[PDB]
């Protein structure tokens, strides 16, 4: 019977993210996955900027960026009648090599299709990953969990003893079901096909017209994205199952007489499900097992990676012994509302496409179809089409309102686009300490107290943390620009990079503050 602190069920992006977070917190763990880490049908390709900030923390951001996506491939989204047909609307998004690094983050989004990401993540996790292994059954005990690890090549079964079991086993989570936890549908389930294909000369023919993603505007079945996966000949076409031959569907979508090789054609379900509970005893749900949503926006894998990072520090805190008895409970308390609002935002992007009218005369050339296209273009812009491709709020703007956060007033009524804020509950904002060091590079270990222009009360804060063995680092900053951004003289940041408390003056009961933020109050 082999034993580990945490047993991770699932070796997809989410499970691997949790493994990386545990390794960087020196927590003993183990990943088991039914597969080798070779994706035959790559699904996801876009990694959001918050996820990249986390990959930067874990030291794999650089290798993700240099993994093979061409620096000169356009990142645009465009709506067209057919690929190589008439163009209706385009959002220019530059290239990797030419776009300006954004002011609010050191890590812009990245393209890394699953068949590059999987081996790259397998490499950084090392031998703690266990491939071709399935979990057949588990049993909860008082101080640990016991599970059955059956080798898929061999057929034989083994036993693992872990303090905690974390289920990252996808949208049809067998773990979730065996716990009796429901995940009701919040919107209609839809059926689509994914056609993966090679088209080696397509990029050359498109030339200036190339895009990261095309939205087709052909028929009721072909109104969905066709995306360039590796920028080197690999593409995926999304086809709706309303109630045709694979090659023929691609031919309809692409108005070039060019080489096309269909690799696979697989059906998938678009679902909107969030679990009623994210844990039961020592068993935790994360990733799709906890929450699935519409990929329209690319929020799904990023929400999972963010949840993995949240669960990660709390598990570590509990195993170290400085956590309060209620800390683990805040995982569901904080992350579940995040899944819900992300789901609903993803569904808005989806409905924009589903409700969009495809008027007659759209495909006809000349002056009349040219006018019709120009009219639709105007309606596309007014519908907020670019929000699907520029959504800082969904990536950076979630604000925790929980029992371990010393929250401020304000309601939830937006007044402008998202803007960086150091308010309690929120992601502490990026700024350049030096040209090489971000404020983000201070976070990710224990708690951090950022003080501007002073060290008053700091010795007291340190003692209060030490008396409960809670890890704390204190940093003094003298940049007025950074002080203005954070708006307060003292800012207390959590192990996950979110603010727990801020103020011009430290509280009188520093012990009460400590117990509060560790989940003991
Ligand atoms: C077509 C499509 C496109 C998408 N595009 C994007 C995108 O561009 N950006 C984005 O952010 N998100 C995207 N998503 C969402 C993304 O796919 C999911 O959020 C994510 O893949 C799920 O994370 P996960 O690792 O928890 O689940 P999975 O990726 O399903 O991980 C499950 C893994 O666990 C293993 N496993 C399962 N059961 C067992 C068992 N009993 N024993 C052992 N091992 C087991 C399996 O081997 C599997 O590899 C997309 C989704 C789809 C369907
Ligand atoms: O990666 C994807 N895979 C599918 C997908 C994806 C993305 C997607 C990925 C990154 C950014 C925006 C995105 N919008 C969509 C999408 N909008 C859609 C509408 C109908 C059917 C599928 C999609 C869709």
């Amino acid at each position: 019977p082999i034993e580990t602190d945490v047993l991770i069920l699932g070796g997809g992006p989410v499970g691997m993210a949790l493994a990386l977070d545990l390794a960087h917190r020196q927590v003993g763990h183990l990943v088991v996955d039914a597969g080798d880490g070779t994706i035959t049908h790559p699904k996801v390709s876009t990694i959001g900027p918050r996820s990249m900030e986390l990959f930067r923390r874990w030291g794999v951001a650089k290798q993700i960026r240099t993994a093979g996506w061409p620096g000169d491939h356009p990142l645009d989204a465009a709506w067209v009648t057919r690929v190589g047909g008439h163009e209706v609307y385009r959002i220019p998004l530059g290239t990797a090599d030419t776009r300006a690094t954004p002011e609010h983050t050191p890590e812009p989004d990245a393209i890394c299709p699953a068949h590059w990401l999987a081996p790259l993540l397998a490499e950084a996790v090392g031998e703690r990953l266990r491939t071709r292994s399935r979990l057949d059954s588990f049993e909860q005990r008082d101080d640990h969990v016991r599970a059955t690890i059956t080798d898929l090549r061999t057929g034989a079964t083994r036993a693992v003893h872990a303090r905690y079991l974390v289920a990252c086993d996808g949208a049809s989570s067998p773990t979730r079901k065996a716990l009796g936890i429901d995940a009701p549908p919040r919107h209609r389930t839809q059926v689509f096909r994914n056609i993966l294909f090679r088209a080696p000369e397509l990029r050359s023919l498109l030339g200036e017209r190339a895009a990261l993603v095309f939205f087709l505007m052909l028929s009721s079945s072909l109104r969905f994205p066709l995306r360039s996966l590796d920028g080197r000949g690999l593409y995926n076409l999304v086809v709706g199952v309303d109630d045709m031959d694979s090659f023929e569907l691609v031919r309809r979508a692409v108005a070039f007489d060019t080489e096309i090789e269909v690799l696979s054609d697989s059906e998938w379900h678009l679902t909107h499900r969030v679990a009623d509970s994210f844990s039961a005893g020592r068993v935790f749900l994360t990733g799709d097992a906890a929450h699935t949503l519409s990929p329209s926006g690319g929020f799904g894998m990023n929400t999972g990676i963010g949840s993995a990072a949240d669960l990660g520090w709390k598990l570590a805190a509990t195993l170290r012994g400085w956590a309060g008895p209620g800390l683990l409970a805040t995982y569901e308390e904080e992350r579940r509302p995040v899944a819900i609002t992300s789901l609903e935002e993803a569904n808005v992007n989806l409905r924009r496409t589903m409700d969009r009218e495809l008027p007659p005369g759209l495909h006809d050339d000349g002056p009349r179809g040219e006018r019709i296209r120009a009219a639709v273009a105007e309606k596309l812009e007014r519908s907020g089409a670019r929000r699907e491709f520029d959504a800082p709020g969904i990536h950076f703007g979630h604000t925790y309102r929980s029992s371990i956060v010393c929250g401020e007033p304000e309601t939830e009524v937006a007044t402008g686009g998202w803007r960086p804020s150091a308010r309690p509950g929120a992601r502490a904002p990026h700024a350049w300490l030096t040209p090489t060091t971000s404020t983000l590079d201070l976070f990710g270990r224990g708690f951090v107290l950022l003080s501007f222009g002073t060290t008053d009360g700091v010795e007291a804060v340190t003692r209060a943390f030490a008396d409960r063995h809670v890890p704390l680092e204190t940093v003094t900053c003298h940049a007025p620009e950074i002080h203005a951004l954070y708006e307060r003289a003292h800012v207390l940041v959590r192990p996950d990079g979110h603010v727990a408390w801020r103020g011009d003056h430290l509280p009188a009961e520093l012990g009460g503050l400590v117990d509060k933020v560790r989940g003991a109050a």
Side-chain angles (χ1 to χ4, degrees), residues 1-207 209-409 411 413-521:
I2 187 59
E3 60 188 22
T4 194
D5 276 338
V6 177
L7 181 62
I8 304 175
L9 183 55
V14 181
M16 299 304 255
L18 179 57
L20 286 172
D21 187 72
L22 295 181
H24 273 263
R25 298 185 184 286
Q26 276 88 27
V27 171
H29 61 284
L30 214 288
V31 184
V32 297
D33 182 88
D36 9 317
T38 71
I39 324 296
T40 171
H41 197 153
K43 9 80 176 178
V44 320
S45 59
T46 297
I47 302 176
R50 226 290 109 149
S51 298
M52 288 303 294
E53 289 178 355
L54 292 173
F55 283 132
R56 173 190 179 98
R57 203 144 86 192
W58 304 325
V60 295
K62 188 185 182 58
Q63 46 261 74
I64 286 167
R65 291 200 196 275
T66 60
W69 176 259
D72 60 343
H73 195 295
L75 296 161
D76 311 347
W79 284 253
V80 299
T81 57
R82 293 170 82 197
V83 174
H86 292 117
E87 186 164 311
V88 173
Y89 189 57
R90 178 175 291 255
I91 309 176
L93 292 169
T95 68
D97 287 349
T98 61
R99 64 175 171 178
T101 173
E103 197 187 9
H104 61 272
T105 180
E107 302 283 346
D109 59 35
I111 317 290
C112 191
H115 61 294
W116 292 344
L117 183 70
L120 190 159
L121 293 180
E123 193 82 77
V125 169
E127 343 78 69
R128 280 144 144 178
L129 161 68
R130 292 305 166 185
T131 50
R132 289 295 289 166
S133 309
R134 57 169 209 172
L135 189 142
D136 276 8
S137 61
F138 63 97
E139 179 190 343
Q140 296 206 59
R141 280 101 100 104
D142 288 44
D143 62 337
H144 70 296
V145 177
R146 184 182 189 275
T148 304
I149 294 314
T150 100
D151 189 351
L152 265 175
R153 68 177 200 102
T154 277
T157 76
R158 241 68 55 178
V160 174
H161 286 181
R163 302 298 200 179
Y164 299 94
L165 213 199
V166 181
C168 321
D169 50 6
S172 68
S173 189
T175 292
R176 186 178 78 226
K177 288 171 290 187
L179 293 170
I181 298 174
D182 189 23
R186 295 180 61 98
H187 299 287
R188 190 177 191 182
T189 289
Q190 293 182 233
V191 195
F192 294 92
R193 288 163 65 185
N194 273 331
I195 307 179
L196 180 68
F197 73 92
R198 301 190 194 272
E201 295 184 9
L202 183 52
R203 187 179 174 193
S204 301
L205 298 170
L206 284 164
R209 295 121 98 228
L212 173 57
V213 48
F214 296 99
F215 275 91
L216 296 174
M217 320 206 316
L218 249 178
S219 73
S220 177
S221 191
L222 267 7
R223 4 143 61 162
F224 305 114
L226 186 160
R227 97 150 31 207
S228 170
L229 287 183
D230 68 352
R232 296 172 187 275
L234 228 216
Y235 301 83
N236 183 81
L237 169 66
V238 180
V239 180
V241 186
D242 288 13
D243 288 284
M244 206 160 79
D245 168 85
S246 281
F247 180 90
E248 211 61 39
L249 286 165
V250 181
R251 274 302 308 126
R252 273 200 142 93
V254 179
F256 287 108
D257 189 17
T258 192
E259 181 179 349
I260 290 165
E261 187 192 353
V262 172
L263 300 174
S264 61
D265 189 342
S266 68
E267 180 175 280
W268 61 280
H269 286 26
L270 180 39
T271 66
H272 312 257
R273 295 177 180 264
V274 174
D276 292 334
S277 303
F278 283 10
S279 63
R282 293 172 172 270
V283 187
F284 288 76
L285 309 173
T286 188
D288 275 19
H291 43 67
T292 69
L293 44 80
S294 187
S296 49
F299 302 152
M301 186 194 56
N302 299 296
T303 308
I305 295 172
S307 292
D310 185 72
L311 181 53
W313 74 272
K314 301 177 181 175
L315 286 170
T318 306
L319 292 169
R320 295 265 138 75
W322 61 261
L327 185 63
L328 277 175
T330 66
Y331 169 56
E332 182 181 317
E333 179 179 359
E334 298 178 329
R335 292 306 295 183
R336 194 173 171 272
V338 169
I340 297 181
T341 72
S342 295
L343 183 154
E344 301 293 342
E345 240 291 309
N347 182 70
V348 173
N349 292 322
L350 178 59
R351 289 295 302 277
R352 178 180 302 112
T353 287
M354 296 297 301
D355 305 344
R356 176 179 309 125
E357 186 185 21
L358 303 180
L362 183 70
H363 303 254
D364 306 328
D365 33 25
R368 166 177 164 256
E370 215 73 69
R371 278 188 289 271
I372 291 183
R373 276 164 252 145
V376 173
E378 170 74 6
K379 304 208 305 181
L380 259 161
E381 174 193 280
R382 294 209 271 95
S383 65
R386 91 124 47 192
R387 303 184 71 246
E388 186 170 346
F389 294 92
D390 185 25
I394 293 305
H395 297 297
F396 300 117
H398 296 273
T399 302
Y400 298 147
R401 222 96 45 177
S402 66
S403 60
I404 57 176
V405 166
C406 300
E408 294 174 352
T411 56
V413 173
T415 271
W418 171 86
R419 259 150 201 111
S421 153
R423 101 175 56 97
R427 160 191 171 279
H430 161 70
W432 289 114
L433 246 31
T434 77
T436 52
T437 315
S438 175
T439 53
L440 271 41
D441 303 313
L442 304 171
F443 313 141
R445 300 187 291 280
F447 282 82
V448 173
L449 182 70
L450 241 183
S451 292
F452 302 94
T454 50
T455 63
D456 278 35
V458 176
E459 186 174 49
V461 177
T462 297
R463 166 73 105 82
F465 273 84
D467 294 340
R468 282 86 171 182
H469 310 107
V470 179
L472 179 77
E473 293 170 82
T474 55
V475 180
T476 314
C477 172
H478 304 269
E481 317 90 359
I482 305 187
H483 187 358
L485 168 63
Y486 273 69
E487 303 183 327
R488 254 90 188 125
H490 300 281
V491 181
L492 179 62
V493 183
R494 290 152 44 135
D496 66 353
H498 284 248
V499 179
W501 173 92
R502 38 126 75 139
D504 282 328
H505 304 287
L506 280 314
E509 297 308 310
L510 289 178
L513 174 67
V514 168
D515 293 330
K516 164 91 169 174
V517 306
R518 70 185 182 97

